[PDB]
Amino acid sequence: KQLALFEPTLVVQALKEAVKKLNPQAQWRNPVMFIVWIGSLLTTCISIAMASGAMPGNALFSAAISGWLWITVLFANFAEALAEGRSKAQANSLKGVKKTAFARKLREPKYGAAADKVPADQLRKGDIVLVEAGDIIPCDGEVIEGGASVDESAITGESAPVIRESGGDFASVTGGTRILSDWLVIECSVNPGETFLDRMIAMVEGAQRRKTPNEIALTILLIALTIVFLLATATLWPFSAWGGNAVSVTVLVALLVCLIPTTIGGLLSAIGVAGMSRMLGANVIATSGRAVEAAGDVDVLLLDKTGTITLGNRQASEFIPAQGVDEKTLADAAQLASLADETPEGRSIVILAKQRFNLRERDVQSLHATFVPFTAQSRMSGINIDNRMIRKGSVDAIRRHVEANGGHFPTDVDQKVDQVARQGATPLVVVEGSRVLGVIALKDIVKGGIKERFAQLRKMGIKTVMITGDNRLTAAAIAAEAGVDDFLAEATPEAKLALIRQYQAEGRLVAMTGDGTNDAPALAQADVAVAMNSGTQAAKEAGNMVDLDSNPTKLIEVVHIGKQMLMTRGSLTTFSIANDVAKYFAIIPAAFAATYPQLNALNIMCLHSPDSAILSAVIFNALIIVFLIPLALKGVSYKPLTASAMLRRNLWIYGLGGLLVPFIGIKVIDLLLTVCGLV
Amino acid sequence: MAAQGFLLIATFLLVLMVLARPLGSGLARLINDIPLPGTTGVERVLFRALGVSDREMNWKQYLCAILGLNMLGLAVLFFMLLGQHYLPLNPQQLPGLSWDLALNTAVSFVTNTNWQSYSGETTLSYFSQMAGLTVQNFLSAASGIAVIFALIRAFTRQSMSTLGNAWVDLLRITLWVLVPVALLIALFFIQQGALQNFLPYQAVNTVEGAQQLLPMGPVASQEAIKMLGTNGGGFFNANSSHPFENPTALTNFVQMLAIFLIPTALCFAFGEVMGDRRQGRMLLWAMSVIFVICVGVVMWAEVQGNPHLLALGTDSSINMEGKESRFGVLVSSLFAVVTTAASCGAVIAMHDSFTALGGMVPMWLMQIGEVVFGGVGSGLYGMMLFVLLAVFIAGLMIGRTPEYLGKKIDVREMKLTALAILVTPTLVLMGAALAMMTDAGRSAMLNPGPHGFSEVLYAVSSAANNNGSAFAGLSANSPFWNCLLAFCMFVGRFGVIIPVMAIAGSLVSKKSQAASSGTLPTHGPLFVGLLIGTVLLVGALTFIPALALGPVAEYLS
């Protein structure tokens, strides 16, 4: 994933064939550029009649006017289709993964049933299908049997694999990823057409993308500026015909195009596409452009605890403090109890506790390992591998089964409840006979370098709020590790709607971010709904934006595009409107020098002839569309600053750069028509 | 000479802000429906014995009350001039007017403009003047404020649907803003030397054998809101240079204050209602900076003056032609920027005889939306079509929806301000196109050359922008000009009122937000440096090719 190819010399060769398929009357939905199309139309229709018979006879000039106005239309459809052509291969980088599959299913709902050979497109929602290890996932669904690690590299470009669990919080499996370790039996939750991969296809492949309600409001200015420049140029002919003789139409169309903001109407259809393609290149799937454009204004975001902040593994392991129990005997039989803890939460104490010791001096079932699973009358999993019993004591049932023999602890374990309050964990108690091991706690294990990301998010001026359904006790130690601004625990999903409407009633835009089915009422009502990729397949569908790598702070890469799809729109307006100052200092002393010779003092740039000056304006209006295609594709980079300190900055480059650059561009191109000396 | 040129501008603005400050709090109470001290109880009678229920009203009902007043606003006036001969207070024997000259001026005094294409002392009787052209001189200046009261209200209401009440508003601007202020402005003029009587025209046997017939009539009553409402209908042909309308220099300095008295204090009143004083204080800081630059250009271009006067053996090259020697050049150059940037149209000095570099700025400042310290009414919402434009292309280059005072600017409020701006540079580019394509328009010129185009261009620019100034060489008593302007005036006002109420009706149903860490500060020397940069560019790129064939072609020759 190189993620950046301006001229890959094969897309642009496949582009020009499509750009010439945009010249006929389908540009009339772009009214800024459609006037340039009619501007290039009749200047041929003048010059063709000027070639045979007309009142003037300078056909070698006006055919060079139309010899760049079509090039201007050809460059507007160039940048419009290039970003569309960019998103073809951007989508085909992952579209060529889905059609490489064909499936097989188990007719009984357990592992090890009767098989068949059915292609993957024939499947529906609710099919017990089998994927053994080493293959690729043919269809989306939830894992109900088996637990394995899968390679999610084909769809999002990862070096690392990712693990799964059956019926927990790793129900996410996406059709197209390779499976590595073990077998999985999944049940499909989507259909071909309702596919998660189809969300990217039908949006990109087609002209079905509607305009955002800020792209719409920008064209209304870009129409209203062409309405004046239609009037303030096509009424110059009765203004000039009275005094002396008139001005030819071949100039008054060249003056009409050089004042119309052609350098935006060629790029406004390109910004709204290339911004959406930069969203996909940052591993974020956007349903529409509106949720991207609304994301520039968001000042309040929310996060789930389970899965959003951490990995959702709901597991940890710290120590065994116990009188008489050695530190060497931490993983003596508690590891065996964690081998008896057949839940994937129990696999953590196998892994996380030995990371200091790695005392691997045992076997699986050599000492008669009576693997007892998660029971019902005791609600626990244990093992009779020592002479005594080894049972996972729960929160309340320490007395009910584990210390039911009359033997208990001296009161250290009573203050281990207090140490849960000092930790904010989901603890597990193990007691082996009278020898009380105590508590191995399971707090949460928050993954990334999120401390710098929340610090980068506070400079962007956005309040950070933690929202969980779990209690206030767990949220204390998690927030101190996270570095969030505020936090609020003990929330139903109805209460999660009762915070969004405590900010949307204040007018702010609310960014819910979560993974669970409790998030799904809040995601379908909030504004920017970023759904994690680890989350349930009913929450991704109920949201409006889905990450591909479960990064909670990837909204920072969303606001960095929702601003770039506005800074590029704003700058090119005040670039193009500031261009027209030097346009009148190129045309007006040259267009009226036949009629009013005393206007030659307004030629500041010392332009050579009253014909090459107009040719320099049409060429400069055609070149500067192309030289701003890397601006319309790569966005506008920015330091994250305040409002009135960036608006100062963003006008030195454009509000003053739009003045000086046409004073340079007309000089150079006229010097190119003087060194070559053509016209 | 600029030492006493700079002092004139600084004296004119020093006295201005001292007078407009306590009137800003006066106009602030009327926006919030707070009665003035003293009018309480009196309005209990006048709103009930007449009968107006103080019923709050939405913008659609509000719009057909100002328009509805101004439909029988001209229906009375169009009939008071055709049936002028059957009316009292005619000491002469003036007949009923022609239909084209009536329709030219029946529109013209409703439309806050007062274009006078006639000699007022050989056209109008007193009852044609007194109860026909002051009754509309109040109800056009109040008709502009009753719009702009319903736009400042549209920025302070929260999620409502009711602007105010029009007839409860219109009975306050006339009875307690226009009348008790233009009574003292009137009675000051009679002391200084103006005219106020009902006598017939008194003949004169001069110190030589020649005779002259001095026109008398009620002037100083009609003169006071000729300047206060930024309206500009002089009783005589010379709108502010006839000695019975402006006798000394001190009346002139009151009349310069009386122009910028309502549309300056109405923006101080805009600071009071929003809570932030600096929110309205920056808005003068964007108007008056364009004004001071556009006075120092005109004063410089008239001290230089006509260069031919030195070769013809005069004393200096100072262009004292067409300027009253009661007034300076520095005072005449100051007035001809005040009377054209502010939609007043009182001519103190015939604008043809300016230099073309100094005659272009009073034709600039009309064409640029009539925005910079503009007319009573149109000075603020004419700027609010450019504030709401400069909020757009500033907020959008932050990565932010264009919020102004908490209110967002959505698509429906850009489909209107596009159509609201586009009325005034359409008609001055369609009327000036139409009047140069014909022979009934081109034959009405007076000066030859490029300047004769500028007389066509200054005329239609003081029709759509509702100024009322004239080069006055344009003999616009033809039935073409009397009807071309009357189209271009009636649309230039009431094609802007409709997409301002539709803006204002769309901004009441929204909800104002609060300031935060990332909202753009509207006050301050950056946004003012952009608001001036937005006004002086959209009003620049759209009129340079119209001006480069006019006076710029005249000046460079």
Binding site: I216, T226, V249 | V411, K415, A418, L419
Partner: peptide
């Protein structure tokens, strides 16, 4: 005002009518 003058006027009002119709619509 020849025959081609009224052609150029109706080419403007076609365009001036088209752009106004584009302004009142979110096409």
């Amino acid at each position: 005002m020849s025959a081609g003058v009224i052609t150029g006027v109706l080419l403007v009002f076609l365009l001036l009518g088209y752009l106004v119709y584009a302004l009142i619509n979110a096409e």
